[PDB]
Structure 1
Amino acid sequence: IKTKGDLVRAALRKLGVASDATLTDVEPQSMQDAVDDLEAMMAEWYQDGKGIITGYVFSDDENPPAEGDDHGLRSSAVSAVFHNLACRIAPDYALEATAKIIATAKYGKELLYKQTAISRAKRAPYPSRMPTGSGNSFANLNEWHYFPG
């Protein structure tokens, strides 16, 4: 919602574990383990910028991730993040995420990568053996063949 602890608490709430709708209370090491899992999942998604970009901020090497650090995700990315976190940490508590949670996580990941896929759908420039036709007046500048890609 606003910090990594919130992403963990909402994910646990979705799974039905450690939520105030069932009078269940939280364990601090559950927070620590789920934050570590969230960090690992976000890093695996990111792949140092070669994968999905969500605006998530990763804790530096010197300071281990904590509950109170802001996630930095966009307002349209929180839902997918905590749904996928719940799916990932479901086996932790000997549980399997319901079909609705899995479907929501898949839909959220699709929506996260939609804009990146649109941005990365860029055509390559013309080949290096393509001639610039006589209709281009820049041909007079000795630019008879295209620049290489």
Structure 2
Amino acid sequence: MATVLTKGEIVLFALRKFAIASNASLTDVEPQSIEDGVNDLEDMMSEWMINPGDIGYAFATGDEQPLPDDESGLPRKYKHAVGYQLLLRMLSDYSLEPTPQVLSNAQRSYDALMTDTLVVPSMRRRGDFPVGQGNKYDVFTSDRYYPGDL
């Protein structure tokens, strides 16, 4: 929460974490890389609408264009997971290979994201399964046999 998390901040985080564009190593930054990163983030969220499921990302309304100053709509609890996944996807543009520690961090953050979405669907009763006489289906309830549908 607190400060809203914009789309450009996530791609800047991803670029920083592998020493490509940050004040801590040599600096420098290029706009075309930013546009490519933002479009990659957009498409990766579109894909994530299937397997991990929706997490509240805010897509571009009409035709337009994503832009790095638009609000992402994500909670701050997800930025590390999203950034690590984006970095993994966009490393190969610069012909670089990830190191084991980065992979471990990405897996831990992704697991934290996965934990906050579980459902465990809690399978039902069938529909021809009787309900006993102890449930007093005459008067208290109705419809002996479970509905098992709805």
Q: Does the alignment pair 1:12 with 2:25?
A: no
The 5 Å alignment of 1:23-102 reads 23-47=26-50, 51-102=52-103
Whole-Å separation in 2 of the counterparts to 1:125 and 1:114: 24
Q: TM-score, normalised by structure 1?
A: 0.88
RMSD: 1.7
Q: Given that residues 45 and 51 in structure 1 are in contact (C-alpha distance below 8 angstroms), is that contact kept between their aligned partners in structure 2?
A: yes
Report % sequence identity: 36
CA contact (8 A) 2:5 2:72 kept: yes
- Please report how far the alpha carbon of residue 142 of structure 1 lies from its aligned counterpart in structure 2 after TM superposition: 4.3
Counterpart residue identity of residue 123, structure 1: S
The code of the aligned residue for 1:23 comes to L
How many residue pairs end up in the alignment? 145
| Structure 1: 5+ residue stretches without partners | none
Structure 1 residue 111 and structure 2 residue 112: aligned? Answer: yes
Structure with the larger helix share: 1
Residue 146 of structure 1 deviates from its aligned partner by 0.6
SS in 2 for 1:76: helix
Where structure 2 has 5 or more consecutive residues not aligned to the other structure, the ranges are none
TM-score (ref. length: structure 2): 0.88
Separation in 1, partners of 2:19, 2:61:
32
The structure 1 segments of at least 4 consecutive aligned residues displaced by more than 6 Å after TM superposition are none
- Separation in 2, partners of 1:96, 1:20: 22
Tell me, yes or no, if the aligned pair for 1:55 and 1:72 is still in contact at 8 Å. yes
Deviation at 1:115, TM superposition (A): 2.2
Tell me, in whole angstroms, the C-alpha distance in 2 between the residues paired with 1:83 and 1:95: 15
